[PDB]
Every structure is written in structure tokens, then in C-alpha cells.
Inverse folding.
RNA sequence: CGCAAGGCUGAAAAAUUGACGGAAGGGCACCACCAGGGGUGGAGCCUGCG
């Protein structure tokens, strides 16, 4: 309630940094111009409920008009058998309503980068009507396999071990009727907590893009969709790379309660390019529009084009994973951390992130040349509550 | 009549158990319902789904039989006991909750 | 004043009928051990299985 | 869509999802046609002519 | 001096000096975090208070009073910060104690333990226990005297026994926080013994609670008492001979 | 072991007694008295069972 | 209902605890015995 | 198509675990026995 | 080990801190990391009342164990430069 | 450690022996006849079940 924010840009990032630094915040003027549906979005209020379930001692207050919330932060407890679930290994359930349009990866990136500072493990299980696990059009949120093989290697670089990260889907869903809809359930078992994340050095040039691996998923359509998408991607990328390999996954359909109905039919593709240097990976994805019915050949060509744009653009991290690696950089110890961005990669969201870090109390960023090198000063808070043995 | 014999008589009236008709008989039928009939038959021939009085009403009054579903009632009350008692047993010691005034 | 006053009936060790008020157990929430396996109540899932 | 497998499919024509497979005739279903005018409010009705001497609406 | 839970204590931890009142606790057998009432002599017990957070593995000290008239060793306790949390789970034993009323071979009615059939029907199916070691179960409320109940035990309990029920009541510390602004001036909360010596109240004691010596006579039993029909009917080889 | 505990570890725990408001009913039966009762009653039941078999 | 829920919780919790510490005891005994046998062989060679 | 990757590459990517970056009767005696 | 008699190490994790019975061997054992090799071994603290004394990330000296988990070879002799038996007997205060 | 572990896909038969009956003739039944008896159901108390 002390610190002051405005606007709805990077709402989850503001909440997550408030929770990490323990600085109590007040976000005013959420949707002031939109008199049709002013105030909070349903994905935002579901994110509030998720954060309140995972935390402990957090007092969140949404005002009457809902255009302003306050947040006094508690501690990141996790799923303890006394407070959040019944067993130490029991998955905390989370249900989000059918009126959701943003992706479960938009729900999941804040949860993942808030996970390794917890007390116990994280066993969060997202079910419910509105859980879309594919790419969304929206503001182009990632897919689940994009999220996994495109940002969890970064925690593996930090030292949060990928052998003990555990993320699994059980049903897959695309958007469905309109932007709303879904059905797929996911669950996430962070069994790896750290005290202080290791400061890192992405400095050496990631020149030779070695290999390209990916996934083509279909939920409700024939396998010919993914196979034509594979022909598209390989016909566009065989001019440059010989080892492109894209798996294909097919799920029947997800069923949603109202007397169930089958929803969330769609098809999408996710590409990952792995550099020979180190954990440097460029990811892109594309989903069919939820009512369009467009050519899978066109979708394969479109996603291959987006991947090649991120290839020619990026320094060492892509634009979707830049804020996560930067906030974990700032979470790191009281040292400088050396990240190599590309000149085209800096975004208004990233500049807003730097603004919010300066506002909260993390030290600044020093920028120089080598694409450009940013050097973050970590604060070294680490996890507040962890039973030392 | 017995349960078995009444059930067989009801199914022969419903045409689900009858003798194997010819193609001519199938033509006659296709020349010339059973879902609601079958649901009534299962409801009436599994009578321990619901608690019933044998004597009937004590004093007959005319104006214009099940008396409760114990299995359905137990499942509903157990679901309510889930969503209240198991919830508080999980959040036995939990400080601070979202205050939603909208 | 709270420290010098007499402890409550809960924070005493040995509570009985003359000590505590009438339905104070209804007011309270504690835990205790149980014995024996309770009888499995019939549910529609058990009957359907 | 009527096959010689004695059955027809209803497809959604966006993403090509089989809205319903349905078996309805003892022989090969030969021809299937809709009714075009929805001005009576019945544009999603269709007839199927089948080699076992049947029209099914 | 030993130090009691609930009693104030001035902690020196990080930069802050701050007087707070902790809650001492043992970790009973790595299950339940039982609340103590005094710290054990020469043992590490789990303390817990309400104060400002510090990252773990940070050692710290504990005084009782910053006076110079203290004739010996002002520092009281040491230790290291184990972790932090909100909404602790401290647990104290509550012993609901009754008394047998009528005693059959196994089942026994118990009187001075409950006040109403409501409370008993809350505690139905409960694991009651005697002092002798006989386990047992609270089974069903009784009706005619309001509050009595029926328990099924293992073997025959005696009218001299006492039935106890061992429940776990949750205790939460108090959220006191002095800062010890010693250069400016500050109010130091006195302890228990000082409060009692100040406003002249004697320390509470129960004559039921103080330890005494028991006088056990040598327990002799009655001899065997065979029923008449059995002793008449058994064969000649084992007929009892009683002059 | 046995040299890895202090004398305060070895200190015996005192046995509580019957409350003074209930001393008239006899001695408070603790574990040892209970074992005496169980041995005596089980022995008498054993001999009575053997006589019933006979 | 509280009887049933607490019995299920206690059973699953005791099962998980027993399984985990069986694993940990076996692993530590395995590693320590392997090193002890390696040292016994490297000592017997002198 | 040749998008079919491998059993190993499926185990790396489509698994639940995220892919880490930090990897790259002779003789008569024996007959009688 | 090595060629020496007493090796130094860091307490990595007091594994078996959540055992039930107090003097269980899994309760007493402590996983450490020998400095001279960077190796991971496991050592015994002589009593649970002194497992309370050993703290995480402390320069812990250990030696041989000559006589429930047969095969643990090392036992803790010093913690942070102070004799562990004296710590348990409450002779010296542990310098941290 | 490896196999199991790659989705023309999207919830609601056998028969030379088989299916269902009908007519006659038997046997059994205080869930049938026959002769009687006794409950409950009227008023109040309450466990229990819905």
C-alpha cells in the first residue's frame, strides 16, 4: 500500500517483484477508459487468487470499482501439509473460469520464476474450463512446449536443476469458441529450491546456430495438419539448416463442464533453435486462429519466418524470455551479471521492467558495447524462508 | 408376480427381449418412447435406490412412491463436507485472504 | 496483566467439566487420535461399481 | 459426407473436425443433400438417400 | 535462572536490539512441534517469536535486562535463526480428564469429562486412555445424566482410575515488539517473578500437582473361585478336594 | 551409548499420585499395578478354561 | 467424515515417510560400503 | 516426411522433464555340464 | 583418505534430520564435502544432542570411526575449530 | 540403463449347438388357500432412517 503503481502494463511482473522484495504496493487506474468492462480482467483476478493461494500472510484488496488494488506481500510458502494442502506431496488445485483469454504460459512464467525462492516445493495443478495450453493470439503468449524447452533451460543455466523441475500436461487445449475456452489440465512440481541464484555471464558470441528441434501439436484435427506443417517448416528451413527435427503430437479433444461439451480444437507449432555455444535458444510459435480455419502450410511458413526473425535479431536471449532472465539476474547475489542482448531485442516491456526495478530498490543496469552488453547489479535477497539444515 | 417374471414381462412388452424377428417383421416394424420406458423400468426394478414406506399413507386424502434418495443425499452431503471441512483442515493455519468487494 | 492473570482453560493442561464452560469444545477446534476403521458408507459410486 | 461404409459424417468445415460420425442405414448411403433456404429457420437439415430403400431426414 | 515461555527477552540479532516475548517449543519426535513451558537445561529447543525477519543461518544473542546491578552473567541465551514464516503451528497438549462412573467388564460410563451430548457427539469415536495404560474408545453419548458417556476399553478399568483424552490444541505467539532504543529511552517489560514481587501475588501451585510419595501395599489377590456346577461336573481325576 | 548422556539425562522421572480430592477410593493404578492385575486375572482365566475343557 | 479423512491422510503420510527414508538409508549405506570396500582392497594391496 | 526425430529426441523434448543445457556348447566338458 | 588422519570439510546437508527415533543412525548421520578432494562423504555426529550443535556450512573436522548403517567410516571430531565433545559438554562456545 | 512409450483419430459376436414363448403334468411355500392367534397403525416418550 506504500509503493505506488499505475496502469495495467506488466501487471504480473509488478505483483511478482512486489512479492519477491516484500515491498507493499498499490496499483491504481487499471482500465480507466474502457467503460464497457472496467477494472480487472478475469485472468488477472485468477492470477491474484493463485498468488494468494501459494503465498501466506498476503493481504490483497480489490476496490469497489476494481480499477485499483493494493497488495501487502507475505512469504512464498509453497505446498506445506499444514497450511496449503493435506500432504507434503499433494498438488494444490487451481481452477480458472471459462471467461479466460490469456494463456496458461502467461499464468505460468510468473509462477515459475517465483517458484525457486519458496519454502517447500511447488505442486500447482491448473484445471478448470479456461486453461488454454497452446499459443494464444491475444498478445501472443507462448505454448506449453515453447515455455518448457525455451525458458526452463535458463533456470538450468542459473543452477535450478532441470532434473528436478517437473512440468507435465495431461490434456491439451487450444482457444476454442472465441477467445474464451480451454480445458487442458497441467501440473507443475518444482522440487528444486535455491538459496541464492548464481550470477551468470552470457557474453561469448552464440554464432553458429547448430540445430533446430520442435513440436507440432494438433488437438481435434487430423494428423495431416501436423504433417503438412512439418513439410512447410522443413521446406523453408532446409535452405539453411540440415538437422531440423519436429515431433508431432495429437490429442483427441478436451471436455468441459457447462453435461460436458468438447472444446478447444486447434493446431499449432513451436520451434526451438539451439546454438552450439551454450544454453542459447531462439524460440517461436504459431497457433491457428480459433475461428479462422487457415492453411497449415501457411502456419508452418509463418512460424518459420518468425523464428528466422528472432534468429537475425537476438543477442543471446529472445524477447519473450528477456524479462525472466533479467529478474532472476537481479534476484542473484550482490554482484554484477553480464548479459548480451541484441540491439533489436529491447522492448517497452523490458524498459518498464527496468523502471520497476529502479522503483522497488534493486540497483541499476550498466549498458555498454561488445549487440550490447547489459550488466545488472544484483541485490542478493534470495529466498526469505527456507528451513536451513 | 416375482421380480424376475415381472421384469421379463415388461421387457417383452418393450420388445427388447422378444423372439428373433424376421426381415419381414423388421419391415413391418419400420412401417409402423423406449428410452423413457427403460429408465422407468430400471428405476422401478432397482427399488433400493430410494427409501419407501410399505403401509402407504396413514389416512387417505384425495386431491390433485419415492420418499428420499439416501445414496444421492449421502453423496451430496459428502461433497459439501469436502468443500467445507476438508478445506478448513487444509487451511488450518492460514493468515490473510483476498478481500473482494465488487 | 495478561501474564499475571490466571491462564485460560485451554492453556492449562488438565481441563474438566467444572473448569471449562458448557459447549466450549464446540467453540474450539483441536485434533486427536482415532481408533478403529469406520464403516464404509454406501455411495452411488460404490453401488455402481 | 456419405461413404459406402453405410455411414455419414458431419464435419465442421473449420479445422475439419468430425462433429459427429453416425451410422444410419443397413446399406450403402448413396446420395446426401441439404436444404438451401434457411429463411424458414431450418438450414441445418439434410436428407440421405440410401440403397436399403430409405430416405432419412 | 531458567527462562519461561511467554516471558520477555531482549534479542540482539542483526543490527536491531529488540525486546520481544517468544514461545519455546520442542520438536517432539520430528512430528508435531510441541510447545514447552521452560527451556530444557543444556539443550537446543525451538524458540519462536514475532519480530523483524532475517535471512537464516544468522546467529544471535539474548539478554534479559540491561542493568548493571545484575550480580552475574547478564547474557541468557544464544543461538542461530533457523527459518522464518508467518502463522506458526505451535501445538500444546490438552488433557481432557474424566472419572469412571459405572464399570462393567469392558464398557464403562465416564462422568466428569463432558458437559453435553453435543460435545460428545463431536468427540465420537475418540481414542481415550487411562492412567494405567489401558487404551479405549469414546463410543456413544449417554442420555439420562446430561454429559456422561460410554467408553469401550481393553480390559476392566478400576474405579480408582482416571480417564484422559490427549488432544492437541493450537497455540500462536503474541505479536509484541519493543524496539530497544537505548540512546533515546525505552520501556522494558518486567518478567514474571518481578511482576509478582511488585504487586504481591503468590505463585500459583496445585496440591494435586506437587510430587509426593505413594504408599503401595503388597498387592495380594483372592484365590481361585470355581463355580459350583463346573466343580460338580468335572471328572474324577480333577475334582477339587476341599475339607 | 552409556557414556554419551549426562546425569541430567539419567535423572529419573517422578511418579504422580492420586489427587487429594479422590484419595478415599484407593491407590492410583499405574502400569506396574496394571500388569499385576493382568497376570493374576489371565492366570485364573487360564485355569478356569482348562477346567471347562475337562 | 473427519475420521475418514484423517485416517486416509495418516496412512498416505506414513507410507510416504517410510518409503523415503528406506530410500535414503539404502543409498547412504550403498555409497559408504562401496567406498569402504574400495579402501579395503586398496589397503590389502600393501 | 522425415520430421520423425528419434526415441532419444522424444525423451529429451516431449518428456515432462525440461531439457537441460548442460549436455551435448564348444567343448565336451561344457556340453556335459 | 588421502594420506592424512583428519580431513576438513563443509557440512552440506544434515540428511536424516526428520527421523523419528532419536538415536537412529540415519538421524545421526551428516553429509559433508571433503575440501581436499571436493568429495561427498557421510559422517556421524556422536549424539543427537550434538547434531543440534552442528550447523550448516561450517568448517567441520572429521576422522575415522573405529569399532545401524554399517559402513559409515567417518565421525565428526571438531566443529568450526572447537572440540565437539567439549561443545556437547558445554565447555566452550561455538565461534561462528 | 533399455524395452514397454508414435494417434485413418476427435465421449455417450458365435450358431448344424442360438432367441422367445404356449399347452399339459408334477412338487413346494404361513412372501399361498384354509382356521385361529398376534403385532404395527389410536395417545405420550424417545434411539434410528429419509
Amino acid at each position: 500500500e506504500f509503493l505506488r503503481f499505475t496502469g495495467h502494463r506488466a501487471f504480473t511482473q509488478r505483483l511478482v517483484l512486489a512479492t519477491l522484495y516484500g515491498r507493499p504496493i498499490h496499483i491504481s487506474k487499471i482500465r480507466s477508459s474502457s467503460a464497457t468492462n472496467p477494472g480487472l480482467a478475469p485472468h488477472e483476478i485468477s492470477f491474484l487468487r493463485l498468488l494468494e493461494s501459494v503465498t501466506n500472510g498476503s493481504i490483497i484488496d480489490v476496490s469497489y470499482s476494481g480499477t485499483t488494488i493494493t497488495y501487502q506481500p507475505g512469504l512464498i510458502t509453497g505446498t506445506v501439509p499444514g497450511m496449503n494442502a493435506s500432504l507434503s506431496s499433494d498438488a494444490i488445485e487451481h481452477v480458472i473460469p471459462a471467461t479466460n483469454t490469456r494463456g496458461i504460459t502467461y499464468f505460468l512464467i510468473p509462477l515459475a520464476l517465483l517458484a525457486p525462492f519458496s519454502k517447500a516445493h511447488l505442486n500447482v495443478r491448473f484445471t478448470g474450463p479456461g486453461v488454454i495450453t497452446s499459443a494464444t493470439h491475444g498478445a501472443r503468449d507462448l505454448s506449453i512446449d515453447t515455455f518448457r524447452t525455451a525458458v526452463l533451460p535458463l533456470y538450468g543455466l542459473f543452477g535450478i536443476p532441470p532434473a528436478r523441475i517437473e512440468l507435465r500436461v495431461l490434456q491439451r487445449s487450444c482457444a476454442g469458441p472465441g477467445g474464451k475456452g480451454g480445458g487442458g489440465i497441467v501440473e507443475m512440481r518444482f522440487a528444486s529450491q535455491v538459496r541464492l541464484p548464481k550470477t551468470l555471464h552470457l557474453n561469448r558470441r552464440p554464432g553458429k546456430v547448430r540445430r533446430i528441434r520442435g513440436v507440432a501439436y494438433c488437438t481435434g484435427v487430423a494428423a495431416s495438419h501436423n504433417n503438412r506443417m512439418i513439410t512447410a517448416a522443413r521446406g523453408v528451413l532446409n535452405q539453411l539448416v540440415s538437422d531440423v527435427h519436429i515431433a508431432a503430437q495429437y490429442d483427441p479433444a478436451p471436455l468441459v463442464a457447462e453435461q460436458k461439451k468438447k472444446t478447444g480444437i486447434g493446431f499449432g507449432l513451436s520451434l526451438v533453435a539451439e546454438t552450439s555455444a551454450e544454453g542459447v535458444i531462439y524460440a517461436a510459435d504459431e497457433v491457428a486462429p480459433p475461428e479462422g480455419g487457415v492453411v497449415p502450410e501457411d502456419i508452418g511458413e509463418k512460424c518459420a519466418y518468425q523464428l528466422l526473425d528472432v534468429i537475425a535479431q537476438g543477442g543471446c536471449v529472445m524477447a519473450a524470455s528477456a524479462p525472466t532472465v533479467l529478474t532472476l539476474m537481479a534476484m542473484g547475489s550482490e554482484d554484477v551479471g553480464r548479459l548480451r542482448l541484441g540491439r533489436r531485442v529491447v522492448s517497452p516491456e523490458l524498459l518498464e521492467l527496468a523502471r520497476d526495478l529502479k522503483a522497488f530498490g534493486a540497483a541499476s543496469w550498466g549498458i555498454r558495447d561488445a549487440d550490447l552488453i547489459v550488466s545488472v547489479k544484483g541485490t542478493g535477497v534470495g529466498n526469505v524462508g527456507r528451513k536451513v539444515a | 408376480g416375482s421380480q424376475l417374471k415381472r421384469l421379463k414381462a415388461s421387457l417383452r412388452e418393450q420388445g427388447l427381449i422378444g423372439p428373433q424377428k424376421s426381415k419381414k417383421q423388421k419391415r413391418q416394424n419400420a412401417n409402423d418412447q423406449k428410452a423413457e420406458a427403460l429408465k422407468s423400468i430400471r428405476e422401478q426394478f432397482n427399488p433400493f435406490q430410494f427409501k419407501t414406506n410399505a403401509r402407504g399413507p396413514k389416512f387417505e386424502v384425495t386431491t390433485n412412491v419415492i420418499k428420499g434418495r439416501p445414496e444421492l443425499s449421502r453423496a451430496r452431503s459428502e461433497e459439501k463436507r469436502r468443500q467445507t471441512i476438508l478445506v478448513e483442515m487444509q487451511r488450518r493455519n492460514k493468515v490473510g485472504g483476498i478481500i473482494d468487494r465488487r | 496483566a495478561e501474564l499475571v492473570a490466571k491462564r485460560a482453560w485451554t492453556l492449562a493442561g488438565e481441563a474438566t467439566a467444572a473448569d471449562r464452560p458448557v459447549n466450549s469444545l464446540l467453540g474450539e477446534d483441536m485434533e486427536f487420535d482415532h481408533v478403529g476403521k469406520p464403516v464404509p458408507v454406501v455411495t452411488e459410486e460404490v453401488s455402481e461399481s | 459426407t456419405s461413404s459406402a461404409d453405410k455411414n455419414i459424417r458431419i464435419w465442421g468445415l473449420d479445422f475439419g473436425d468430425c462433429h459427429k460420425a453416425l451410422f444410419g442405414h443397413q446399406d450403402s448411403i448413396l446420395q446426401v443433400a441439404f436444404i438451401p433456404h434457411n429463411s424458414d429457420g431450418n438450414g441445418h437439415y439434410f436428407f440421405s438417400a440410401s440403397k436399403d430403400r430409405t430416405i432419412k431426414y | 535462572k531458567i527462562l519461561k515461555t511467554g516471558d520477555p527477552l531482549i534479542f540482539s540479532l542483526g543490527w536491531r536490539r529488540f525486546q520481544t516475548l517468544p514461545i519455546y517449543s520442542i520438536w517432539d519426535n520430528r512430528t508435531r512441534n510441541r510447545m514447552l513451558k521452560y527451556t530444557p537445561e543444556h539443550m537446543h529447543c525451538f524458540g519462536t517469536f514475532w519480530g523483524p525477519l532475517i535471512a537464516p543461518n544468522t546467529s544471535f544473542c539474548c539478554f534479559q535486562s540491561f542493568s548493571a546491578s545484575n550480580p552475574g552473567f547478564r547474557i541468557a541465551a544464544t543461538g542461530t535463526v533457523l527459518s522464518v514464516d508467518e502463522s506458526t503451528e505451535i501445538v500444546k497438549k490438552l488433557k481432557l480428564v474424566g472419572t469412571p462412573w459405572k464399570i462393567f467388564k469392558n464398557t464403562a460410563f465416564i462422568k466428569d469429562m463432558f458437559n453435553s451430548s453435543l460435545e460428545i457427539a463431536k468427540f465420537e469415536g475418540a481414542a481415550i486412555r487411562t492412567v494405567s495404560g489401558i487404551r479405549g474408545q469414546i463410543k456413544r453419548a449417554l442420555s439420562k445424566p446430561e454429559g456422561y458417556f460410554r467408553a469401550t476399553f481393553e480390559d476392566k478399568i478400576l474405579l480408582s482410575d482416571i480417564v484422559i483424552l490427549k488432544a492437541w490444541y493450537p497455540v500462536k505467539p503474541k505479536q509484541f515488539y519493543n524496539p530497544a532504543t537505548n540512546l533515546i529511552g525505552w520501556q522494558s517489560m518486567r518478567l514474571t517473578g518481578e511482576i509478582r514481587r511488585a504487586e504481591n501475588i503468590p505463585t500459583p501451585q496445585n496440591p494435586n500437582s506437587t510430587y509426593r510419595k505413594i504408599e503401595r501395599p503388597e498387592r495380594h489377590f483372592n484365590p481361585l473361585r470355581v463355580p459350583k456346577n463346573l466343580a460338580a461336573e468335572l471328572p474324577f481325576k480333577s475334582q477339587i478336594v476341599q475339607t | 551409548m552409556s557414556s554419551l548422556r549426562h546425569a541430567i539425562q539419567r535423572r529419573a522421572h517422578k511418579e504422580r499420585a492420586q489427587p487429594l480430592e479422590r484419595q478415599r477410593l484407593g491407590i492410583l493404578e499405574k502400569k506396574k499395578d496394571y500388569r499385576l492385575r493382568a497376570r493374576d486375572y489371565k492366570k485364573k482365566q487360564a485355569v478356569l478354561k482348562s477346567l471347562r475343557q475337562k | 467424515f473427519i475420521r475418514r479423512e484423517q485416517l486416509r491422510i495418516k496412512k498416505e503420510k506414513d507410507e510416504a515417510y517410510e518409503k523415503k527414508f528406506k530410500r535414503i538409508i539404502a543409498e547412504i549405506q550403498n555409497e559408504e560400503g562401496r567406498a569402504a570396500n574400495e579402501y579395503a582392497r586398496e589397503k590389502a594391496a600393501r | 516426411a522425415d520430421g520423425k526425430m528419434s526415441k532419444q529426441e522424444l525423451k529429451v523434448y516431449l518428456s515432462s522433464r525440461p531439457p537441460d543445457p548442460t549436455r551435448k556348447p564348444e567343448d565336451s566338458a561344457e556340453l556335459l555340464a | 583418505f588421502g594420506g592424512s588422519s583428519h580431513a576438513k570439510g563443509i557440512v552440506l546437508e544434515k540428511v536424516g534430520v526428520e527421523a523419528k527415533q532419536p538415536n537412529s543412525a540415519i538421524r545421526k548421520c551428516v553429509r559433508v564435502q571433503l575440501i581436499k578432494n571436493g568429495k561427498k562423504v557421510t559422517a556421524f555426529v556422536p549424539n543427537d544432542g550434538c547434531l543440534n550443535f552442528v550447523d550448516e556450512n561450517d568448517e567441520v573436522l572429521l576422522a575415522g570411526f573405529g569399532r545401524d548403517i554399517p559402513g559409515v567410516r567417518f565421525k565428526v571430531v571438531k566443529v568450526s575449530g572447537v572440540g565437539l565433545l567439549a561443545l556437547w559438554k558445554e565447555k566452550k562456545e561455538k565461534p561462528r
Q: What stands out?
A: Strands of chain D lie at 7-11, 18-23, 29-34, 46-50, 54-56. Residues 17-19, 21 of chain D lie near RNA strand J (CB under 10 Å from a C1'). Chain D is about 0% helix and 45% strand.
